[model samples]
Target: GSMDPAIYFKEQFLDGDAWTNRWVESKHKSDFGKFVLSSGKFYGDLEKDKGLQTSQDARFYALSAKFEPFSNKGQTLVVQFTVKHEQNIDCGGGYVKLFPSGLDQKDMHGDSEYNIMFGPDICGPGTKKVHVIFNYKGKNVLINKDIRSKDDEFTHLYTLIVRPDNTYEVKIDNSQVESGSLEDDWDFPDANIYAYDSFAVLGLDLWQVKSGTIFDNFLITNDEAYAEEFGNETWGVTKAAEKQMKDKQDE
Candidate 1:
């Protein structure tokens, strides 16, 4: 139930025009791509899976959604979202970044400060991979694991969970793909931006050449139960038919 207090966590859901009030498009560049609320070329439900679709080729996209700031001290912080690259995304970023509440949404850019960066980053063919990078002691620490990323036309989920114990885990389409200690995998001698830090915004700061990348069901909170259930409710119901349609088209 959307009314469940369990589901009260901050979410960008991207269902309709609600994001318009919550999201701020960057004024950093005149050429920055626009985000249109679209479910794209294929899906299980037309209006249900709707999301912010990038609307231009060879352009930058920087958009942030503001939320009440919260600290991740002695708690688990999870960043979960769904992305669909309908244009096949020859080279681009389908990831989302988390930032502090004080972010200048209008001035946000590719180089702006972020606490966490998660999801697939594509550049040409072999450059495809799921990135799990976190800010630690003022430095961005990338995971040492070589996690492969999805690059199909179907919608897929991405989840990144960072625990207070200084460990992390990553998942795609609700399946656990990787897990390890932050100190061991990253160069962080282990501060992990932890002891807790105030984090609030989720920005879709990306660059795309092919365009038509739809982002949806974005949930950032410390609740694993809610994230899983939300993914099931949003991406799960549509995934099968989405795949079936794509399969028929590819055939």
Candidate 2:
């Protein structure tokens, strides 16, 4: 009998200090950015919807965590996370990195290697795109498609799934962006508490947010609906209110 729930790993960033216990800051660079827990300018549930956000400009951000290790070897793999870009985003990185357990998390940084990378990203030039990269033969591979990421005010979900048969599915807000053979796209590989070695927000580029780039509701599990339900519980519920607020700002 399985003692644990069907889910593999989950993080809601429930409290302020709780993040420190679950995540660590790397000293790889002395002047990196700082991440604070916030829901940005608005929200549906203030207490429940808060997220880990970048708090500085032109500074690198490095935060990593590890959790009880689990595998999707015999099952499907689903990795999901959310982002709320409060700023127009003067160009930066927003994807999280899934590094293997063999990593030295204490020094996790841009130079470190990762097995999988997914999530939305955009540049100041309006290069809004979602990234799906896999590590193969010591090189990182990219999905052969043009996937645009949401740069609006409201939060949007990003899901990267690899089914048992080697097919991969990429999604945003529960909608499919692209799907294909995992092997056809990249190579092989594969996050947290029970951080094997580690995974991180990785780091973002120069540009400060007065209050922007909110991230929360991270999940790494096999149950696909679990990710959907999780989103419905958090972002989905509040998405309406967020839109209303956006309308106000626009006017």
Candidate 3:
């Protein structure tokens, strides 16, 4: 039981300025994740007129957390979270992804990474299906699923398991939806940045577009890493007094 409960993020930003508060606040940032909470079709940019509006009392916020394997060489990682579709709007949809950055047209160097292509689904409004996509080592693999209803008002739990053996699996509400492996590097870019301390919660879609989605109770736990664990064995201790060691060295 080497795991501990830590606050990756909270609703701590609601107490301050309703608008123009970049991210939560100045303090408690390390434990805070990146997000855009609103009721309309707001892009990633927080400073937009069409962005999230609080005066109207939309009361919608999306959040996400990120964790990386202590070592990335041939490893398996699992991520899970719970989301409750609080409300539905004309254009509202939310998604969580294990994206890694560093790949661009050499013109747009955005810190927000590309979709690792796992755990993405858009619900409510004009959207009906969510794409489960992943890009790693220059490869694009994906799975598409269609949602039945939007008024269910039920919380769904999602889990994503990725392996260094070139395998990826996903489960929604304890049900497996997609499972596959990565064997080729076709249509994929090179050297994507693996985010060590970053994760994204998208509000509305830019490509397979959707609108309005709220997420909470997000959780992420990593599998046992095979890397060298930090412990006393990694450190050495000598059973000699300081004076004795100095005298012996001088002799």
Candidate 4:
């Protein structure tokens, strides 16, 4: 693990103002979903100081920003983010998609080309899962492996590490849940694809009920160690909360 992140993007949302200049709302789709930056409170507790808040029961609202792409040809790629479902979501998407370079952030949609899409997705019953999608040769291929997503009214961290040797690891909080070779877990081509970014979107898509999901501390890096280190480096979590997460992971 290393600390050299080729492309590090983070949004703590401490400014108390919604991102206006750094992000663009997609006009391509007619969804009334809205994303805002605010302090999150639920179940008598606040989450992570501040984060991005998605409107409950909103349509397909997305916020995207431009950044330079960091290729995974020779290094391990790490993606990390924190999400909290304050409204006790029964159905919705709390995920993000990394797009290719030069994409128009203002118009990017599900049809836009992207290099990777990774995050937590949840619904009632058996639909709770973490999605891992990689774009290969114009096709967005999903991983064959199934990773269960955590469903609770609290903050959780999702981290994914993909190596140049075709191996990948998925972690919830600081604990590893799944790790395997990319070739075995996904149907990928025999070549490598460089990841460039025009912009990437953090989306909230709801289906069943109007639910609130907060997103914060988004990051992407080329060093696996860096991600792990950063994740373990505590900022404001109490010892009781940390123990709770560990106990939950153990169970």
The clash numbers for all candidates, in the given order, read 0, 14, 11, 4
TM-score of each: 0.91, 0.86, 0.46, 0.83
Best by TM-score: 1
Colliding residue pairs in candidate 1: none
lDDT of 4 by residue, 1-251 (tens): 26345665766554546457667777777765777765554321244446667764746665676655544566677888777776778788877787656666667655437777888888786899999988876788998988999887677889988777777899988789999877778876453543333334444333426557777777777767767667665222522564465466655
Model 4 / residue 93 / CA error / Å? 0.4
Error of 4 at 80 (Å): 0.4
Q: What is the clash tally of candidate 3? A: 11
The C-alpha lDDT values of all candidates are: 0.82, 0.71, 0.37, 0.68
Give the per-residue lDDT digits (tens) of candidate 1, residues 1-251. 65442221355454467778888999999889899888777777777778889999998999988777777887788888888988888999998888876788889998547888889999999899999887766788788899999988888999998888887889999989999888788766545454346776788899899999988887876778778888898889989888776777776
lDDT score, candidate 3, position 111: 22
Predicted model with the maximum lDDT: 1
Candidate 1, residue 222: Cα displacement in angstroms equals 1.3
Per-residue alpha-carbon lDDT of candidate 2 for residues 131-150, written as tens digits (9 for 90 to 100): 88776556777777789888
- Model 4 clash count equals 4
lDDT of model 3 at residue 84?
A: 36
Looking at model 4, residue 75 earns an lDDT score of 68
